[PDB]
Amino acid sequence: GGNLPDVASHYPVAYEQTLDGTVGFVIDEMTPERATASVEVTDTLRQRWGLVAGGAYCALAEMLATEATVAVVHEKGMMAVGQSNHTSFFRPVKEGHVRAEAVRIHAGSTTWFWDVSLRDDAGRLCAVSSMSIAVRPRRD
Amino acid sequence: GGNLPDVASHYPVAYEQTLDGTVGFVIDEMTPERATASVEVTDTLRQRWGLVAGGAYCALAEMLATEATVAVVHEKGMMAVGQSNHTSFFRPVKEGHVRAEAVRIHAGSTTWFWDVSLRDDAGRLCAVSSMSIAVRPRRD
Amino acid sequence: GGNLPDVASHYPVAYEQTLDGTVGFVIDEMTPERATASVEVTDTLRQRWGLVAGGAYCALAEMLATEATVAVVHEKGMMAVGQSNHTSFFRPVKEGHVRAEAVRIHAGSTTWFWDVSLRDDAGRLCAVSSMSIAVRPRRD
Amino acid sequence: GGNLPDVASHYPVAYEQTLDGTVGFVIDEMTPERATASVEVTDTLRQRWGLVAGGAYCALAEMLATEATVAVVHEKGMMAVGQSNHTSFFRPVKEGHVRAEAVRIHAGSTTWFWDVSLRDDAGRLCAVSSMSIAVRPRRD
Numbered sequence: 001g002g003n004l005p006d007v008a009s010h011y012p013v014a015y016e017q018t019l020d021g022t023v024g025f026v027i028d029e030m031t032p033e034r035a036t037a038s039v040e041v042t043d044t045l046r047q048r049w050g051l052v053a054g055g056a057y058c059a060l061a062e063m064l065a066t067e068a069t070v071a072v073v074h075e076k077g078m079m080a081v082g083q084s085n086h087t088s089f090f091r092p093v094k095e096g097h098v099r100a101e102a103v104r105i106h107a108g109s110t111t112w113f114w115d116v117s118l119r120d121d122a123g124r125l126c127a128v129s130s131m132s133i134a135v136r137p138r139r140d
Numbered sequence: 141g142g143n144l145p146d147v148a149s150h151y152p153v154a155y156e157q158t159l160d161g162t163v164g165f166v167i168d169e170m171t172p173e174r175a176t177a178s179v180e181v182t183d184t185l186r187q188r189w190g191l192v193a194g195g196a197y198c199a200l201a202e203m204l205a206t207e208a209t210v211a212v213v214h215e216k217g218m219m220a221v222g223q224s225n226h227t228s229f230f231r232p233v234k235e236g237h238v239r240a241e242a243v244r245i246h247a248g249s250t251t252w253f254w255d256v257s258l259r260d261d262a263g264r265l266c267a268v269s270s271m272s273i274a275v276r277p278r279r280d
Numbered sequence: 281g282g283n284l285p286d287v288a289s290h291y292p293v294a295y296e297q298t299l300d301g302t303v304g305f306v307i308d309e310m311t312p313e314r315a316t317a318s319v320e321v322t323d324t325l326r327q328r329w330g331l332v333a334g335g336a337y338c339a340l341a342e343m344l345a346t347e348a349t350v351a352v353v354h355e356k357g358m359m360a361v362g363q364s365n366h367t368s369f370f371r372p373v374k375e376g377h378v379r380a381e382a383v384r385i386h387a388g389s390t391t392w393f394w395d396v397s398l399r400d401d402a403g404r405l406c407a408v409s410s411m412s413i414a415v416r417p418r419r420d
Numbered sequence: 421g422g423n424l425p426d427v428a429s430h431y432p433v434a435y436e437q438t439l440d441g442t443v444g445f446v447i448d449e450m451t452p453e454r455a456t457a458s459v460e461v462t463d464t465l466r467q468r469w470g471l472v473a474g475g476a477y478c479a480l481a482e483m484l485a486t487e488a489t490v491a492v493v494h495e496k497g498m499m500a501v502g503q504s505n506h507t508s509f510f511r512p513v514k515e516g517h518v519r520a521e522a523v524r525i526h527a528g529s530t531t532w533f534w535d536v537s538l539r540d541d542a543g544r545l546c547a548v549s550s551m552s553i554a555v556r557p558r559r560d
């Protein structure tokens with residue numbers, strides 16, 4: 001179950017069948033201000049040229065940012081969803097792992113912003129994602 | 141597979157095994173200025189809350205934009221990779237298909253820029269992605 | 281007064297003393313779904329290398345997008361403000377004019393999105409800005 | 421003026437006459453990895469609603485990031501221009517100063533990337549800008 005925050009008795013999609021569980025993401029640490037996650041590179045994470053697909057780093061970042069926000073706001077009657085993701089790609093990843101670290105930089109009443117760094121096994125900065133997370137009252 | 145441009149005799153990773161083949165993306169039209177693709181929504185595309193993951197829209201966008209660039213520049217001795225992807229999420233998608241249309245808006249010597257709209261089965265605009273593609277001389 | 285929409289008896293800053301009036305922006309057309317604006321290039325719009333400063337195209341886009349939203353939402357008791365601007369720069373402008381055209385692509389209850397194209401005197405696409413406009417109940 | 425890097429004997433436009441000189445931007449520190457600048461808020465920086473215009477944060481960011489790149493690459497025969505600017509707006513600024521700190525996060529051969537934070541007099545983070553800078557061989 002990816003070590004995601006446990007905020008509800010039931011979720012619509014079991015984690016392992018999600019896009020996230022399919023490609024094998026796992027959350028390591030999570031606090032209100034910071035969170036980390038990682039994944040092993042396999043072909044399922046790659047595109048046909050053999051590099052990790054840009055959308056894999058975006059998916060990693062948005063799950064980490066979104067769920068770190070859910071962790072806080074769910075018990076407050078709020079829902080949180082990705083509203084925008086700007087990801088830039090500095091160095092490709094061919095194999096090994098991708099490690100993500102999300103740092104909360106603003107927590108507003110309606111929008112939280114996380115900066116997510118994505119590093120290879122050598123610790124080099126391969127991508128960054130700025131995630132903006134919409135926070136809204138839950139619908140009934 | 142998935143009807144990508146056939147520009148080389150073999151590829152590092154078989155399409156059906158890539159992230160893109162796993163989630164079921166299929167390219168329909170492709171021209172130097174415009175390309176379309178679509179995918180059937182299934183759990184493998186969703187996150188745990190039962191909506192299509194933002195990363196899925198981003199990966200559909202970047203494949204369509206990048207591969208549409210490859211189809212032109214590969215024979216000219218160039219490589220094309222995603223360098224930035226800014227995606228914004230307007231309406232969630234729970235089920236059906238996601239249909240993408242990529243329109244080329246600038247074709248520089250070093251950077252091509254594509255705007256990709258992602259629509260649900262009702263035609264509603266659920267996400268947009270601005271793809272910047274780096275075009276460089278092949279190393280090998 | 282830049283032909284901005286007249287929605288209030290008093291504004292805190294006279295338009296001519298604004299950043300916008302300083303560099304000489306003027307709105308030409310405005311509807312709920314589309315709006316246009318232009319400016320003459322002068323040194324005040326340039327940076328020290330003699331090209332139009334990237335922030336000039338961003339300022340043009342955000343005023344056009346924001347105020348086209350104000351035009352609709354003000355009389356509804358709402359305020360509208362720029363929440364994010366992603367601008368990409370395809371060709372520099374040395375002299376002449378910059379013309380902007382803003383197309384509304386999503387109008388949500390809390391967020392409207394405008395795509396803004398910025399063209400030179402030859403009609404070439406020099407920059408694009410994706411403006412996301414936050415819409416909130418006015419404070420008292 | 422404004423304490424920019426002095427890398428050439430003359431410049432196309434005198435700084436005091438540029439957009440940047442008109443609004444009063446001043447660079448404080450500059451190193452190959454980090455740079456700071458600030459500006460006093462006056463009407464010339466604001467829009468009509470009395471808040472600092474988003475374009476002002478963007479122009480302060482892009483000048484600091486681009487000029488910090490110029491200071492390194494100019495002597496190597498390169499030019500540096502802003503190619504993308506993604507700025508997000510967290511808290512408005514009504515008066516005081518805006519202080520910017522640019523941190524270099526990637527220095528590629530063709531693209532440098534800078535993250536610029538913009539803070540008010542209380543130290544609060546009011547906007548962030550991700551600057552991508554293109555680095556190319558000079559034409560003349």
Ligand SMILES: CC(C)(COP(=O)(O)OP(=O)(O)OC[C@H]1O[C@@H](n2cnc3c(N)ncnc32)[C@H](O)[C@@H]1OP(=O)(O)O)[C@@H](O)C(=O)NCCC(=O)NCCSCC(=O)c1ccc(O)cc1
Binds near residue numbers: 418
């Ligand atoms: C975008 C947003 C409204 C979203 O709020 P959020 O992320 O949920 O943050 P939160 O709602 O927690 O509020 C943070 C601060 O925003 C302000 N704010 C938020 N909502 C409101 C509201 N309904 N009414 C007044 N102020 C508000 C207020 O300063 C608040 O601080 P506090 O008084 O609550 O301590 C808020 O982050 C924000 O105000 N950001 C700054 C927006 C900004 O300054 N943009 C650039 C100026 S407007 C764009 C422009 O350049 C322009 C130029 C010419 C022209 O003619 C028109 C526009």
Ligand SMILES: CC(C)(COP(=O)(O)OP(=O)(O)OC[C@H]1O[C@@H](n2cnc3c(N)ncnc32)[C@H](O)[C@@H]1OP(=O)(O)O)[C@@H](O)C(=O)NCCC(=O)NCCSCC(=O)c1ccc(O)cc1
Binds near residue numbers: 247332333372499
């Ligand atoms: C970024 C890039 C160089 C990339 O090139 P590209 O996407 O491959 O397009 P391509 O290289 O095909 O060339 C497009 C045009 O860019 C210009 N360009 C490209 N390479 C060069 C070069 N090496 N030298 C001079 N101009 C060039 C040239 O105008 C070209 O047209 P043409 O003469 O070739 O017909 C190009 O898209 C571009 O120049 N964009 C505009 C950049 C811009 O104007 N940004 C805003 C101004 S700089 C940032 C700023 O505000 C600032 C403020 C204060 C300050 O102190 C410093 C900076």
Ligand SMILES: CC(C)(COP(=O)(O)OP(=O)(O)OC[C@H]1O[C@@H](n2cnc3c(N)ncnc32)[C@H](O)[C@@H]1OP(=O)(O)O)[C@@H](O)C(=O)NCCC(=O)NCCSCC(=O)c1ccc(O)cc1
Binds near residue numbers: 066079233388391
């Ligand atoms: C961002 C926002 C909430 C803002 O709303 P807006 O721009 O003001 O638009 P508006 O509020 O007019 O609502 C449009 C539609 O959004 C939905 N929506 C808006 N607010 C709500 C709400 N409070 N509750 C439920 N649905 C809402 C609803 O579908 C609405 O349609 P309608 O039922 O009202 O006709 C809305 O545009 C939106 O829902 N966009 C889509 C967000 C999305 O699908 N993102 C990607 C999935 S979440 C990110 C992710 O990938 C993830 C992955 C793994 C993981 O573990 C966690 C997350």
Ligand SMILES: CC(C)(COP(=O)(O)OP(=O)(O)OC[C@H]1O[C@@H](n2cnc3c(N)ncnc32)[C@H](O)[C@@H]1OP(=O)(O)O)[C@@H](O)C(=O)NCCC(=O)NCCSCC(=O)c1ccc(O)cc1
Binds near residue numbers: 047054090274530531
């Ligand atoms: C975009 C750019 C080429 C620009 O280069 P830069 O910012 O100047 O950095 P620089 O050129 O200094 O080189 C950085 C590294 O990039 C790689 N690189 C740069 N130029 C080249 C080249 N001509 N050929 C091969 N690799 C290169 C190389 O790894 C280099 O490290 P090194 O071997 O030089 O030490 C580089 O930053 C980069 O390669 N970024 C990563 C691009 C990326 O991985 N995007 C995601 C994958 S491609 C998009 C996608 O998902 C997709 C999916 C499906 C599909 O069918 C097609 C595409």
